[PDB]
Design an enzyme around this catalytic site. Sequence first.
Site, PDB file in Angstrom:
ATOM      1  N   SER A   1       7.714   6.251  -6.718  1.00 54.40           N
ATOM      2  CA  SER A   1       6.256   6.302  -6.880  1.00 54.40           C
ATOM      3  C   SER A   1       5.643   4.883  -6.890  1.00 54.40           C
ATOM      4  CB  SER A   1       5.885   7.170  -8.063  1.00 54.40           C
ATOM      5  OG  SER A   1       4.509   7.434  -8.092  1.00 54.40           O
TER       6      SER A   1
ATOM      7  N   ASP B   1       5.973  -4.859   4.066  1.00 54.59           N
ATOM      8  CA  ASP B   1       5.051  -4.790   5.164  1.00 54.59           C
ATOM      9  C   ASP B   1       4.272  -6.090   5.418  1.00 54.59           C
ATOM     10  OD1 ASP B   1       5.816  -2.183   5.389  1.00 54.59           O
ATOM     11  OD2 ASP B   1       4.024  -1.367   4.357  1.00 54.59           O
TER      12      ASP B   1
ATOM     13  N   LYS C   1       8.977   9.451  -3.462  1.00 51.64           N
ATOM     14  CA  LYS C   1       7.916  10.130  -4.176  1.00 51.64           C
ATOM     15  C   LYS C   1       6.606   9.541  -3.682  1.00 51.64           C
ATOM     16  CE  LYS C   1       6.029  12.808  -7.217  1.00 51.64           C
ATOM     17  NZ  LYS C   1       6.233  12.609  -8.656  1.00 51.64           N
TER      18      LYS C   1
END
Lengths: 256, 259, 538, 541
Positions: D318, D329, D343
Amino acid sequence: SEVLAVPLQPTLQQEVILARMEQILASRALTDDERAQLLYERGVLYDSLGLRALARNDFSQALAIRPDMPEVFNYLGIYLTQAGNFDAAYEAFDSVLELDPTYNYAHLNRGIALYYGGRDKLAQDDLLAFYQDDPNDPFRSLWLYLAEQKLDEKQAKEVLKQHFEKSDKEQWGWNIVEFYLGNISEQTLMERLKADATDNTSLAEHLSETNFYLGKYYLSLGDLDSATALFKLAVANNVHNFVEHRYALLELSLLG
Amino acid sequence: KSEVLAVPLQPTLQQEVILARMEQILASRALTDDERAQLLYERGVLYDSLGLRALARNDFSQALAIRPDMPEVFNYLGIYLTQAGNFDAAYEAFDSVLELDPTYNYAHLNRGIALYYGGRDKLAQDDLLAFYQDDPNDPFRSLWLYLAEQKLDEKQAKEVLKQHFEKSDKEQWGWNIVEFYLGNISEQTLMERLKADATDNTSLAEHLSETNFYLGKYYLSLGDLDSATALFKLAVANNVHNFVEHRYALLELSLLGQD
Amino acid sequence: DITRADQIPVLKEETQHATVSERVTSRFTRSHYRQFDLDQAFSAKIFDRYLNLLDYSHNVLLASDVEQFAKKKTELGDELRSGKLDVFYDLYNLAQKRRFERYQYALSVLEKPMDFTGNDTYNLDRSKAPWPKNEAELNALWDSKVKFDELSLKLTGKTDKEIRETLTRRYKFAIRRLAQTNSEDVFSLAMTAFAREIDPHTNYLSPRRAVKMSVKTVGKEKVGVLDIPGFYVGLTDDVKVQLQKLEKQNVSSVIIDLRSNGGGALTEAVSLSGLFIPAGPIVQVRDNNGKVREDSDTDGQVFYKGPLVVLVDRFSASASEIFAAAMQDYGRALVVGEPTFGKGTVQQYRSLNRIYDQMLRPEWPALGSVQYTIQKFYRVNGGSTQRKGVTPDIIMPTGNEETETGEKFEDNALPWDSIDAATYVKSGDLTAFEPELLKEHNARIAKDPEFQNIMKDIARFNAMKDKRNIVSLNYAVREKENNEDDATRLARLNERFKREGKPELKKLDDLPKDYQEPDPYLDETVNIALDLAKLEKA
Amino acid sequence: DITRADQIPVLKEETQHATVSERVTSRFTRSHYRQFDLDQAFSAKIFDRYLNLLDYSHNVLLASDVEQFAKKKTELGDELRSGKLDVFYDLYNLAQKRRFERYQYALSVLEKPMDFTGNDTYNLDRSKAPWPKNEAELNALWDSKVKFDELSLKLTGKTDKEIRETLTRRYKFAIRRLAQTNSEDVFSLAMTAFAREIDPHTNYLSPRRAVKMSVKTVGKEKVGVLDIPGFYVGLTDDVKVQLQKLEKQNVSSVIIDLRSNGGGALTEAVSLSGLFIPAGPIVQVRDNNGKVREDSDTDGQVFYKGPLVVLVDRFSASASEIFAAAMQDYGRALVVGEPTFGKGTVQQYRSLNRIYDQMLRPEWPALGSVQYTIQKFYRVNGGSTQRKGVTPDIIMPTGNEETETGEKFEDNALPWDSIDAATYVKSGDLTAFEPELLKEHNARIAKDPEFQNIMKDIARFNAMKDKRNIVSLNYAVREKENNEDDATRLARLNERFKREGKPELKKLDDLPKDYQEPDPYLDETVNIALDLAKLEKARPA
């Protein structure tokens, strides 16, 4: 020479009533039942003047005094719809119909909420039930059409055509339907709008309604420039309590 | 019709929580008489700004019943008597403003406007010329003065407007409406400069309120009642309730509807 | 009591008067129907008018007293705008002094022997007279005035001892007046000078009956007469009552009598008109700003529909004239009598008090009022009633003369003018009948002795208006005129009584106090109404 | 106590349950992220799921008991919409009866002689098994189950007399359970059947530490390690504190340890990201209605600017995953470890109470709650974290294997999908280094004995997962596996102790309770971080 009304202004009556309502609420002349009733009534008035936050306050206060007023949840649900909180709006309408399952306008409003909430089949369930309760009311066919358009464009149109053909064709709104069906042009619609309006208030009302459905038509065709203008022109009428005014505002919010 | 249009303005959450708060405080008895008349004044200004002028007048009258020497209150009652077409009584109210406080400048603007709609062009020009001299770089002061002078002498009004522009710092946006009035720019350029200057919907709406009113008056004085009518309604559509241009777009429409 | 100039108190502006002047000027310059500019030309005229209020007869002030203040006559607009009232109070105190000089000189003159055997005259109108240059010139003017006052009383049978007793009382009283004048009387007169230059119905004010019906019967024919005193609230209802009653009596025609019917309620003129026609507009009302309201009777039940005559005179004013003009313009009724007053405007009062005066200046008194013109009346055909009034279809001999009464004679009366006609449908025409009505009218009044006498009195009043203002100071000339006046009256009365089978009077004072003049105008209007009835029937 | 089926109370819906069903259905059908239609296809699946809740092992109900109610399986949506719960309570009472039959049969089988010499097997996963046709078939399945339960206890050293004492206790307790089941337990399980068909984080609910820093040192080189337990409110502030403190030392690089870090506050993932990158969006949040909100850190201040590794594992869930994905990224940190949990969604609770319930039905109890999914997370590059999680730049050996845990294994987990990339500026690149970092990593772990043993355990687990659910009922076969398990562990420990200069253990139970396993993954990540430190100072432009 397009078709414009003078934007509506609060009437003297609406303003003296508000002033009277303030005094009464400040007084000790009201039972609890009478107070919740008056808070409801003042909410309805403030909504009609476009003061929806003041309205919600009077509505919440009403429910604090009596929590079983279906009429109040209906408005709270509307407000949650305009605020984009569809999820909570569903809860409010369920509450309307749990208190009073014969409270028809909850079906309209839950349908609209479900429409904006991207639950088109569920919206259709509510709006079809609202339709069956008064099929000669053209606006019931129009909201039903808006929901069905997202499921199946060609079949929505067919059901709208049938709804028109079975109706008594009396109420002015059938002219917006005629436009939606391809039976008349936009200029003819406007021609019939001016002919049917009798004074500025009826002109403003017709323009509120009509510019919203014209707006929606163009938006579904991808013409965002025309849709944007049309929604603003609906809102310009200041017909604050029309559903078409409320959702012209919501449509504009989503284009921003 | 691809006009320039804003979303018509709506009450902000702040304006509505303040009103709710004001109701509670007035319903308490926690207030000096001075404080109460001040709060009634403030609530009137808020209600006027939301377009609730009868509720405003009520709070204003109540204020004067508590303290009758608030020039700020007479100024608003004078404005309302102007919108109602009761120019006579509006003059009384403004005289009262300036008797209580002769430095209350905006009474000169508003008495000017009242005398303009009341067909007393020389007297209007006196009040508007005095309002001008108190802030000559405010273009709207030159615009209202021009409207009054246009009725005395069209050619000489235009010349004095040209001079007022040439003297000015040319900074405030309204000089573009003047430039239009003077023949220096076209209607399309005005609208281009309006959108360029607006930054958000509230500033766009305001610019359109102002600008559609002066465009409306320009066309009216040319005899084009269809264009004037449309433009006045388009000004009002912005819901900038406390602009003088909003108030008199409404009044102008009332006079087109009677005729 | 009071024996010298310096015991007359010097009058001073009260602390509120500057403010009141500012407030008055504000109302009059901004809101009056008449759009005048309070410039230098206007200021001079206010000045001239103020002098005539201080000295109507031009026999109290000196030309040098006047020129002293006339230098700055063009500044009076400024004075009024800024509440400087020095010119008004200075002139008023000077006038009080000059007045006491005149009255005390007059008291001295009274003792001198009176001789009324001259060929001298007295002018009653000195309002255009040059201002007297000095005391000698004033003294000659008051020799003349006291002689007029003396002779005036002699011609009512008083003794020289009694003339001097009366005029002593009068002149001593006029002096006690001077001492009892206050600041507000001065202020009041200054605002009157402003007011009345605008128009004659505008003023500054210091702080503190039903319808009758009869029936006249000529030959076998019957005419109903509605004697309307005023346009009182309720009139239109009391007139319905009376009209159903005349119907029971089956009357050939109806006269509405609006003689001496002045002022009144405009709503009542509109609703009364309603009883005789069914259309829209009765009157168009214009405000101070070119805006025109059209007033209509919208319950188009006609309660009459029969021949109708409206009887009017020079004293028919305001509401009266609207009703008569409507009935004329719609071709509904024949109008008979004299051209009316021409009261074509409406005034309204306004308090000068402000809600914060008591709080900020508790020591002030209450402040009083202005009255000013706000509206002008127009007929349905576009013309105003202001000045021209209503011109009757048949003008009684008294109407074909210029009168000294009416709006057209009042000082600075607003002009007549016109607007566009309103939309309306004429209910009849009646112009067809006009040349026969006039021929029969002219036949009847050549033979009626009341009319014959009115013609004579008119010819005589016309040869005498030449010298109207010039009165003789020769007692014999004036007695002889009083006696030919009494003898003419006596003969007039006696001519009447011989015709009626009533006893002749031996002298004029044997006439009962309660004696009612006959009403020839009403009698001849009954005849006119019956003529109309014939001609309308076929 | 309780000896017959007819003394099990027949359970009945309470007066409020019809209403609660209507309310639950209203929330799930209208507001869930997943837009399912509660039609006949869906109703059937709710039905199948409810059966598996009643009988997980497919050894209590008969195929005839199931087909009886399967005819009306497609009507369950209607039942739920209108608060008719007859099918749920009828099946639950039938299940209670059938269960008592099974337990009482098990009490009887227990006294029979036990023989564990057979070469039979027991399947632990009967979840796709045909429903048993009759009592004989049930009885064979419970012969098998009781044998498993018996043998299970025998392999922990118990005697036959003690196995029969325990299983008597256990089976009698399971019967006492049946009598103590209430109406709310039935309702609850019916709403669970609805809930969990939508997704595995959706539910009906009946009414009722800080970041630590150390420094690791290899040669004369230093690496700071931030051991983050959770994304707690306040974390981002405690991490500033720790980063200033590491600066006062001179570390070549920093490791953030998000292993076993689950749940947490999303704001904290956004703000923590802020400490390592200048500006921009960290995550895109999509609601139940296609609307996308972009969350950003708008402070501007980078507090680190130095080589950074994020260490993650299959239990990183999460908020953890958002932070690691952002750092990946933006090219800001190297990610090391295992693919994370996946998640990718957020749930919210709602009360089923309404403000007028107390007044209009005073005799009702309080009513409880729903939990449902409302939002899905997307990365700045467009892809969701749902399912795929974050894929590390260097994958530790246990990461190159499909595991039992993670969102991709949960029942009816929503799919991965993607939206458009957000607008953002990459702060670094790090792609060049990848093949040298991997070559050096692979060199080091070929020679490390912990890693060598992990690869061995993976080869053995992989060749064993074929019959993973198939357990032998032969006592000797099962003892021999337990003994090779204990002997391998003992050798593992002793290999460690010989290397460390520590005394050998004689048997496995002589090991201290407080014994700490080593942390090879963290040790090897320190080496990875230092490698990164070289390749980053050696970069010219």
